[PDB]
Structure 1
């Protein structure tokens, strides 16, 4: 429990807070608001559980059944089922999972700061940090369709390297002026992908 408390005080230096940022009819605005609501709720749950494990591990506090299960999962290093809500690749270890969650929470903090001041259109979002990226893509298509008063079902995708998406990485290919060439590298990271609907 000494090293358990040591790691348990090591992790939450990457997790601080998140605001909840509510009268807007924009699909992107409401999608990002519900996204940050889910993120803030999950962050509050994780931080409260973490504080409970701090209290039961280094201090005076009785351990409940939930605390005993959480302590056992943290000792074994496997991700607890309560914390796992978004899609994680093949059950990642808690050490990398808390870093990924810190990255997602920092990203949502950047969205909250940008919305504190349309305004939310100019931001560049990494699709990895979002809890659901296909919903973001569909909301982007809805936003451009409603802002131009266009049909939803007749919109193709034009991809360049009015919305910026970062973190997309290729698999055995390279890009130069939107041209694909076969490469022996495992993954070449695209710097910034530009999505436009026509």
Structure 2
């Protein structure tokens, strides 16, 4: 179908823009006492989980649109939202302005992950 081909390009393109790695902050006896580490650890922990979920969902959609895995109920719900351009409710994990569409969320989500990577990189290389 026409939608099946168009959605395949969009999902593959989104996997290019969205980053792929997010390393959790290493908890340390003196890092727990640091308030900045405590807040920043939450950001990556909730950020890493959201990053993996979106990438896995997008990869399944690409594989579905290549006719390699069968469409499940979750995929049917996700694919319907992506065709209509509505941001999936599963992806919605941080507060966003009302009326934000899926194309803006992917670009917004990609920027947030980059900042999350830099924060973890500083903690990994240099310390908290």
TM-score, with normalisation over the residues of structure 2? 0.74
Quick one: structure 1 residues 59 and 32, their matched pair in 2 at CA, closer, same or farther if it must change by over 3 Å? same
Query: Which structure has the larger Rg over C-alpha atoms?
Result: 1
Q: More helix per residue: 1 or 2?
A: 2
Structure 1 residues 114 and 102, CA gap change in structure 2 (3 angstroms): same
C-alpha contact (below 8 Å) 2:64/2:70 kept by paired residues: yes
Which consecutive residues of structure 1, in runs of 5 or more, have no partner in the other structure?
117-197
> Which residues of structure 2 form unaligned runs of 5+?
1-7
Dislocated runs of 4+, deviation >3 Å:
1-23
Q: What is the rounded CA distance, in whole Å, between the counterparts of 2:80 and 2:87 in structure 1?
A: 11
- Name the structure with the higher strand share: 1
Q: Does the C-alpha gap of structure 1 residues 12 and 67 become closer, same or farther in structure 2, counting only changes over 3 Å? A: farther
Retained in 2: the 8 A contact 1:53–1:67?
yes
Shift of 1:58: 1.5
**CA spacing shift, 1:109–1:89, aligned 2, 3 Å:** same
Post-superposition CA distance 1:145-192 (Å, at most 9, x none): xxxxxxxxxxxxxxxxxxxxxxxxxxxxxxxxxxxxxxxxxxxxxxxx
In structure 2, how many angstroms separate the alpha carbons of the residues matched to 1:97 and 1:109?
18
Q: Residue deviations 1:80-126, cap 9 Å, x none?
A: 1000111111131111110100010000001011112xxxxxxxxxx
Q: 1:24: how far off? A: 2.5
Q: State TM-score, norm by structure 1.
A: 0.50
Q: CA RMSD in A?
A: 4.1
Larger RCO: 1 or 2 (CA < 8 Å, sep 6+): 2
CA distance in 1, matches of 2:50, 2:65: 22
